[PDB]
Amino acid sequence: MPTGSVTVRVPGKVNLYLAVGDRREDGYHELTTVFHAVSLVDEVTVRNADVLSLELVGEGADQLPTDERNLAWQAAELMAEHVGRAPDVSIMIDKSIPVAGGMAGGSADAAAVLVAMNSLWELNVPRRDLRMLAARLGSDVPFALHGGTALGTGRGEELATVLSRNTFHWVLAFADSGLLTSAVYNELDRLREVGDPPRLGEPGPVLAALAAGDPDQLAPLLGNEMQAAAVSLDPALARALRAGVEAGALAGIVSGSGPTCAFLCTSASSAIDVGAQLSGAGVCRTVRVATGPVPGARVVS
Ligand SMILES: C[C@](O)(CO)[C@H](O)COP(=O)(O)OP(=O)(O)OC[C@H]1O[C@@H](n2ccc(N)nc2=O)[C@H](O)[C@@H]1O
Questions:
Q1: Topology (CATH) of 1-163
Q2: What are residue 151's DSSP bridge partners?
Q3: How far apart are CA 53 and CA 112, in angstroms?
Q4: CB proximity list for 101: less than 8 A, separation 6 or greater
Q5: Which atom of ligand 1 is found nearest the CA of 31?
Q6: Which of 73, 96, 149, 231 is the most buried (most CB within 10 A)?
Q7: How far is it, in rounded angstroms, from Cα 122 to Cα 117?
Q8: Which CATH class is domain 164-301?
């Protein structure tokens, strides 16, 4: 019967700051990160149906599974189970977060499914239950629910919200192929065995520049301890980082293990010109402008 539909908009993210602790056993690394949600988004529409189904549209959407191995599918199952229900829902995802872009689009979709089902079934399970479900689903789901900018400590503990005085303007560029996050951690571990790569300061100055809304202040503090390793596995990333800056960006970094390179610019006009130049210059398959921070998963219907 029921018939209505709920759509939830949810953003991709970039890492403005990433410190990576020394390898533990069993083999993991403790991460400290400043997450920043930006205006490349997916929209996820959920309706009552006879059985659970999932469909995706948008560039690259045809690469993605539409069964259990999709995190948005797992989210519906977990959300339904949480409230003792069958996940009798159909899910349609309009994808504009670049696929395999390293912006955590799968985790964004999972978070949007939680929020959408909450509203469609008129439940209001509390935000803290959604966060607990997000954490079972995978380590980037919680931030997709939180959005804006947050500091995360990698310990299962609560994200710390950071507010910004003004909006920031980015160019995001995506390589034609990503790297295995496994390969990047191994290469990080190796470079730390044979040399002394860049160790970042603690994140307080990043937070203070974000708070000030000041891109000239934030630009030189952007940092990623995985970057030297990504750049050792894919040396073109170094030229690409230079081109973005030559094109007029304040600074660029690789986000996470890649493929995103994120370039902070001084303004919307400036981001449009840097993006036009980069796109013209051929270093990257895809170039897009975005702003941040933007909100996490929210109903927009
Ligand atoms: C969350 C990220 O660390 C960065 O966005 C990555 O997406 C990695 O997450 P993941 O691949 O789901 O993590 P797992 O499935 O447990 O294992 C992937 C491999 O990446 C390495 N890895 C991942 C996370 C982490 N904090 N430290 C680890 O060194 C692990 O050695 C692991 O063998």
A1: Ribosomal Protein S5; domain 2 (3.30.230)
A2: 34, 160
A3: 15
A4: 12, 174, 178, 259, 260, 286
A5: 26
A6: 149
A7: 8
A8: alpha beta
